[PDB]
UniProtKB/Swiss-Prot annotation:
Interacts (via AF-2 motif) with the coactivator NCOA2 (via LXXLL motif). Interacts with the corepressor NCOR1. Interacts with CRY1. Interacts (via AF-2 motif) with the coactivators NCOA1 and PPARGC1A (via LXXLL motif). Interacts (via AF-2 motif) with PROX1. Interacts with FOXP3. Interacts with NR0B2. It is found in: Nucleus. Induction: Up-regulated in the state of obesity. It is linked to Immunodeficiency 42: An autosomal recessive primary immunodeficiency characterized by increased susceptibility to concomitant candidiasis and mycobacteriosis. Candidiasis is characterized by persistent and/or recurrent infections of the skin, nails and mucous membranes caused by organisms of the genus Candida. Mycobacteriosis is characterized by infections caused by moderately virulent mycobacterial species, such as Bacillus Calmette-Guerin (BCG) vaccine, environmental non-tuberculous mycobacteria, and by the more virulent Mycobacterium tuberculosis. The AF-2 (activation function-2) motif is required for recruiting coregulators containing LXXLL motifs such as NCOA1 and NCOA2. A motif (AF-2) lies at residues 237-242. Residues 5-243 form the NR LBD domain. Nuclear receptor that binds DNA as a monomer to ROR response elements (RORE) containing a single core motif half-site 5'-AGGTCA-3' preceded by a short A-T-rich sequence. Key regulator of cellular differentiation, immunity, peripheral circadian rhythm as well as lipid, steroid, xenobiotics and glucose metabolism. Considered to have intrinsic transcriptional activity, have some natural ligands like oxysterols that act as agonists (25-hydroxycholesterol) or inverse agonists (7-oxygenated sterols), enhancing or repressing the transcriptional activity, respectively. This is Nuclear receptor ROR-gamma. Belongs to the nuclear hormone receptor family. NR1 subfamily. Isoform 1 is widely expressed in many tissues, including liver and adipose, and highly expressed in skeletal muscle. Isoform 2 is primarily expressed in immature thymocytes. It comes from Homo sapiens.
Length: 259
């Protein structure tokens, strides 16, 4: 590539990300005074473990659906073969959401936006996976300390998705070329904006792996305890990405073909 081509890459990633945001940043900032009462928190903790899991998996699936749309609008993603598109989404959709999630987190009061209002991690006690929850909160805290801009989140989440080290890729070099181009783009925008100091503060890639792995493992425990709940009330797409052997569902293929 070259300079104008890299700066055009920057604008197009930023555009693709704006169009496939679930929630505008300003909508989430305007809502930060809107915080679950202690009575509403108590109501969340008294919800059954299985209904809370169903509600969280539903919200997570909705978030993942915008990540699929981000990828379909991302330069060069749709020139990749369908196997590689699917491998990249299967490994990275959760990761992209974990990163996008820091926009919904308030580091002043350590709350996250959830079902209309903001609540600390005690909101999620009924899940019985406090470790996974505090890790997600800790991770979102550390990303909020960096004061990402929206443009930076778009360029970083594009690299989270386009990772040429995902096992199972069939055109690894083609993904490597794509990755390298987005890294140049990311790093060029940081240099232009005097923000390269964040490079050494970004999370190691192992951290995102670790968070997804925790998620999948707690899902497995839960699915052993409530196998019919998962079968009957979790979203098909969620099951395709996260449970075993839930990829009998082929939703991603459908999402990727549909214009
Ligand atoms: C860490 C606690 N925790 C979970 C733990 C386990 C499973 C699911 C969740 C979970 C889901 C949400 C959620 O989906 N809330 C609505 C929402 C909409 C748009 C945005 S966004 O615009 O930043 C783009 C994704 C952000 C949040 C929030 C917090 C959550």
């Amino acid at each position: 590539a070259s300079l104008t081509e890299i700066e055009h890459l920057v604008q197009s990633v930023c555009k693709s990300y704006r169009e496939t945001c679930q929630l505008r940043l300003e909508d989430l900032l305007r809502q930060r005074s809107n915080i679950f009462s202690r009575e509403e928190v108590t109501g969340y903790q008294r919800k059954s473990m299985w209904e809370m899991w169903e509600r969280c998996a539903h919200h997570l699936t909705e978030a993942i659906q915008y990540v699929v749309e981000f990828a379909k609008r991302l330069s060069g993603f749709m020139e990749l073969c369908q196997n590689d598109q699917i491998v990249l989404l299967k490994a990275g959709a959760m990761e992209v959401v974990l990163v996008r999630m820091c926009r919904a987190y308030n580091a002043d009061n350590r709350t996250v936006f959830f079902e209309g209002k903001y609540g600390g991690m005690e909101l999620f006690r009924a899940l019985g996976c406090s470790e996974l929850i505090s890790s997600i909160f800790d991770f979102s805290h550390s990303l909020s300390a960096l004061h990402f801009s929206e443009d930076e989140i778009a360029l970083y989440t594009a690299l989270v998705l386009i990772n040429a080290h995902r096992p199972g890729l069939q055109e690894k070099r083609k993904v490597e070329q794509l990755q390298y181009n987005l890294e140049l783009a990311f790093h060029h925008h940081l240099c232009k904006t005097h923000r390269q100091s964040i490079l050494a503060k970004l999370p190691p890639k192992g951290k995102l792996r670790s968070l997804c792995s925790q998620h999948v493992e707690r899902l497995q425990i839960f699915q052993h305890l409530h196998p019919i709940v998962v079968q009957a009330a979790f979203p098909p797409l969620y099951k395709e990405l996260f449970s075993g052997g839930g990829e009998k569902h082929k939703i991603l293929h459908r999402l990727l073909q549909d214009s």
